[PDB]
Model the fold of this input.
Amino acid sequence: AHQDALPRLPVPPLQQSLDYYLKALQPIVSEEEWAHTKQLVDEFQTSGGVGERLQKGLERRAKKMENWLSEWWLKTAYLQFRQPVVIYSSPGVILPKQDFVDLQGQLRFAAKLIEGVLDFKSMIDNETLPVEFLGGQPLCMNQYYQILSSCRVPGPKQDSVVNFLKSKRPPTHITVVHNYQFFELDVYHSDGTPLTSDQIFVQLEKIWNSSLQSNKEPVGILTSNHRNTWAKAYNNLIKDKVNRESVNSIQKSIFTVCLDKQVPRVSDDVYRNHVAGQMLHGGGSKFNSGNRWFDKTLQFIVAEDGSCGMVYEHAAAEGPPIVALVDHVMEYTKKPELVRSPMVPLPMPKKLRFNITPEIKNDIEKAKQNLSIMIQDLDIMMLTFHHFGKDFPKSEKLSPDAFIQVALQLAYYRIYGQACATYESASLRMFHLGRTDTIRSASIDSLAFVKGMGDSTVPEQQKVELLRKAVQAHRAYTDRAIRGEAFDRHLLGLKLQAIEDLVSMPDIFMDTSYAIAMHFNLSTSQVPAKTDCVMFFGPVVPDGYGICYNPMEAHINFSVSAYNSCAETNAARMAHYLEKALLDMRTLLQNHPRAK
Done:
């Protein structure tokens, strides 16, 4: 009923989008390249031309489908992406560190966490999860029905997803991994009632005692390899009926809980960076990378030292829906432990076995080698910006997110001397089945500001004006994107429509300007959460950065990633310049009051 009342994703007018495209290109391409693209655009949109025909095709597509973009996006962005999901696709999350100091404490917390997710699940099962709004504007809730009891499945050409949430007999178990060993744990009794936190603890204790040694092959590490490689290894793994049953249990589980092992202590200044690594990829074959199943949509990680977090498979949902679950769960783990009814006998959680063959052992070794290379190449820098949060920008009547994005543009320019194609995720949930579109942070106004900011000939008064204009221009682009008026998904649609129409690939998509526009040296996303957490992910290009943040009232949690294979990037440096840019913007604004 709620979904039926939501507006359908629109197809923007052709000229409007192309006009916005030309404006977004101005700061990132040469004068010569822009002039050439301008000519291609004029020809592409001409009356009776190629572009108009494709546009008509997209409009027809919107009339015959619930959402014209959904399937195309899922396929192009995720299912057909063949690189490992680890680092390159699945975002990691670091949650507030817990105070437990030993094994029993680690298990007690895991029990509360599990109970909390099940509490959230009750609202999903009963479709009682409150509809979200944006001031009076309804949001699509479909993503919430794709995260539990689901899993990505390797395919030889493209991947697929399985979702058991609404099956005849929905799964009633979660999977728990300890020392690379997987267990099927029922979290509901036969009578249908959920297990209590105390009962769950008792079961986790059995699981722990049944996996005290780390001498079993880390089959789960196979899920971290290239999708072509895993597709083949997967097909071979499940040829054996027992292995197939074990994989089936993992795929069907409501979610997976990873009880990680102790790891070497590191200097306090790089601790959070190492924890982020643990949450994103596991740290390596000798640490916790084998204590995972990366195809799983939801994986909660409880570390030996109190740290906790999670990693989720991106084909399922975006950051906001995931943090909605996080906020609900963390809040639940803080609730007073009420009366505990007389417990009852519990079954032995089933240890999922894997019959290893020389072939499977080889695949596992190859996966370890591949992951080692990936981890060595990742550069992560976690930054807790304590100076201020949403409070300062708000006091200046400036959008906090826009303020942060402009600061990132300033930091990038200060390091590189030029702007770069920049991506910021925009939520399209105001539309039925809406996922995301692109907000382009590098603009005519942002470039004018960053140049003016560092120009020793431009008066500070002018720098201030340029600052506000850039921030408001970004806010405007953000508002347009959320209302389905951005142009990136639209252009992608036109390209996919051309492919489906069996017409020659239009020149506008083969243009050097389009290649530049689609190569994001800065890939970013704001994921606000009530919980003091932070999300992170790998860059989308070899010479880029992956930046995510959670703006709180008085501070901001930042993550910055980069690849070591690119000598031109450095996560720490980027983080430091971002911190300084934010501070310099506050300083400038405070030194030039609007009324006194």
About this structure: The first strand starts at residue 92 and ends at 95. DSSP finds 19 helices and 16 strands in the chain. The chain has two domains: 1-66+383-596, 67-380.
